[PDB]
Amino acid sequence: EPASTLEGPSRPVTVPLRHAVDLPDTDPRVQRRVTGWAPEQIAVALSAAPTSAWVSWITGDFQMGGAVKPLDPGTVGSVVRYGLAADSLVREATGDALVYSQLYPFEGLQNYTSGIIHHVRLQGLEPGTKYYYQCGDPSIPGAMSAVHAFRTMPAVGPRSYPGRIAVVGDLGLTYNTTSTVEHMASNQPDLVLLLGDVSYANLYLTNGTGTDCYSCSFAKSTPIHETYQPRWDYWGRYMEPVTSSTPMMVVEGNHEIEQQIGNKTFAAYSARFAFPSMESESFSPFYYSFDAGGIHFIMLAAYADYSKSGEQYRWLEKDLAKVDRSVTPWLVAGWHAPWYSTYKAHYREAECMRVAMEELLYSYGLDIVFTGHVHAYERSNRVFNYTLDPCGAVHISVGDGGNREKMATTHADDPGRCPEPMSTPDAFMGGFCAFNFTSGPAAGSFCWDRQPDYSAYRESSFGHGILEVKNETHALWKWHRNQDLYQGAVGDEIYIVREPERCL
Ligand SMILES: *[C@@H]1O[C@H](CO)[C@@H](O[C@@H]2O[C@H](CO)[C@@H](O)[C@H](O)[C@H]2NC(C)=O)[C@H](O)[C@H]1NC(C)=O
Ligand SMILES: *[C@@H]1O[C@H](CO)[C@@H](O)[C@H](O)[C@H]1NC(C)=O
Ligand SMILES: *[C@@H]1O[C@H](CO)[C@@H](O)[C@H](O)[C@H]1NC(C)=O
Ligand SMILES: *[C@@H]1O[C@H](CO)[C@@H](O)[C@H](O)[C@H]1NC(C)=O
Ligand SMILES: *[C@@H]1O[C@H](CO)[C@@H](O)[C@H](O)[C@H]1NC(C)=O
Ligand SMILES: *[C@@H]1O[C@H](CO)[C@@H](O)[C@H](O)[C@H]1NC(C)=O
Numbered sequence: 001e002p003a004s005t006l007e008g009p010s011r012p013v014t015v016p017l018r019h020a021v022d023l024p025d026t027d028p029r030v031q032r033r034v035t036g037w038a039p040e041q042i043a044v045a046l047s048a049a050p051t052s053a054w055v056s057w058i059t060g061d062f063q064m065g066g067a068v069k070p071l072d073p074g075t076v077g078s079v080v081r082y083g084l085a086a087d088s089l090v091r092e093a094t095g096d097a098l099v100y101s102q103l104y105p106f107e108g109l110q111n112y113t114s115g116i117i118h119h120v121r122l123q124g125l126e127p128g129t130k131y132y133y134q135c136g137d138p139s140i141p142g143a144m145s146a147v148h149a150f151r152t153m154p155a156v157g158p159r160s161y162p163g164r165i166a167v168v169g170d171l172g173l174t175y176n177t178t179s180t181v182e183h184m185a186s187n188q189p190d191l192v193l194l195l196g197d198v199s200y201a202n203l204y205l206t207n208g209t210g211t212d213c214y215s216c217s218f219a220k221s222t223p224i225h226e227t228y229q230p231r232w233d234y235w236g237r238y239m240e241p242v243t244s245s246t247p248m249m250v251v252e253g254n255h256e257i258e259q260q261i262g263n264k265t266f267a268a269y270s271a272r273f274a275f276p277s278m279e280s281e282s283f284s285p286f287y288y289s290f291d292a293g294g295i296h297f298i299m300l301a302a303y304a305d306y307s308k309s310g311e312q313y314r315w316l317e318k319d320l321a322k323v324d325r326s327v328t329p330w331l332v333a334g335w336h337a338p339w340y341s342t343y344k345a346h347y348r349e350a351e352c353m354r355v356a357m358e359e360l361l362y363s364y365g366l367d368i369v370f371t372g373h374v375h376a377y378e379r380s381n382r383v384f385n386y387t388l389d390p391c392g393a394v395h396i397s398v399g400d401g402g403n404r405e406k407m408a409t410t411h412a413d414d415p416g417r418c419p420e421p422m423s424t425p426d427a428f429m430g431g432f433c434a435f436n437f438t439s440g441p442a443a444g445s446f447c448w449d450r451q452p453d454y455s456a457y458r459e460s461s462f463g464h465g466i467l468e469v470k471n472e473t474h475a476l477w478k479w480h481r482n483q484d485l486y487q488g489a490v491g492d493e494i495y496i497v498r499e500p501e502r503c504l
């Protein structure tokens, strides 16, 4: 067996160091492979409970350029036919349709409007069961999809778990992304968690010119932080073999802000994916919860008000108060920005969110946190308030999905690399919370001069993780690096062991 957290914290490990190229729009995998109103970009999402699930798709090509004319979503129906066998799709559900636009009121900038997006919630599903389905508008010739299939999450209970949960962040759409997704798909996950920073459409000007770093290239010569929205459609098209067969839960990162006319934000993210916002009573696309077997998952918003007085915090208090840890023993959270990353990139950037929410989550025995944002892999030792703590959560950051932005290689503890404190806070959310340490080895300083003892493992490689919850106390975590392709390759592996009698 591998190591486990029961042993206590491990001595920190840094793996010695060894851009990605975006997929072109000529790649067959991103081109429109259907015609007319046939469904494309088909994706499955979980509901709050295993007995319900979402099916989403887009019908119609997008428009990019001059005088875009948003489509009337009421002209194409939203129907899913489904059943327990591919030849008996005898159940039927209907849903809603919408469009979104990406509009810029600046001379020279091109406008975008989407195909018709559809979201349909399937009710009355058996847990742990394979469902065949086809989606589209049966009243339009040729406007129904091929038969697809997905499996619902297992029933909620302390011995009932999805076999494998894949965890990725900051995918983008490069050839390295295809390596990440191929590795992930070959592990046959029952569920994919995507921790923000999806398509990186905002590394492009509206006329399709891209860059590895917007703030380097275009920030000073453009009137707004532009996007090329078709990258989302390319992304959705590329991902369809996964998303149409495997539930995928997304939470927003900073590249989803995509500010546009009227200060509108998150238009693409909010419209394209299905979220269990109503079922989990968040009534927000930016944070929500769901149960997958005996795991209660909380997706939190690093880019919506997280202060103790705000709506998200109030919702989180209620959500945590409803969790029965004899029914869902595992309490796992995901959000975009890491709290305990030790790379220079985004070092202590989400400190205000940690200060707002960490004590609440600790008081409810949060087991594991997954994040993205930092383009590298890191796993923390169990930690609470910068203190190694046997009841603190394990914080794992997998923002290394392979987007075209530079990899995080510099560490804040590298000689002379400690960033200036005032340069760290997230500008979008504001506030300043990152003060010098008052205790421990780094007392008096903003950074350590070596790998902090709460960092168990850090490596500047692309890859993905797999969580295999075994029972009410043990979960096996595996992180796989992209450059390793041989059977059984694993970069980092540990048993996360919870001790409810110790901590709850
Ligand atoms: C929960 O699952 C873990 C891991 O599978 C169990 O621990 C293993 O039990 C087998 C059989 O005794 C041992 O051979 C392994 O070495 C154990 N692995 C580790 C990391 O401890 C554990 O016993 C299970 N707990 C319950 C209540 O069923
Ligand atoms: C894009 O849409 C905005 C808002 O409707 C409009 O002001 C602008 O002129 C449009 N630009 C083009 C090139 O159509
Ligand atoms: C990204 O993909 C390219 C081409 O396959 C490869 O050479 C490169 O090493 C990859 N980058 C990383 C960090 O793995
Ligand atoms: C897009 O416009 C920018 C200038 O705003 C230009 O530098 C770039 O080469 C153009 N890209 C395409 C695909 O036309
Ligand atoms: C975290 O540590 C700081 C500094 O010692 C302390 O002031 C603060 O109260 C602690 N936060 C919690 C929730 O205990
Ligand atoms: C905090 O630590 C940094 C070095 O990491 C130091 O330059 C700075 O002066 C310190 N600020 C205070 C108030 O101690």
Ligand SMILES: [Fe+3]
Binding pocket: 170, 197, 255, 373, 374, 399, 403
């Ligand atoms: Fe990112």
Ligand SMILES: [Fe+3]
Binding pocket: 196, 197, 253, 254, 255, 336, 372, 373, 374
């Ligand atoms: Fe990010």
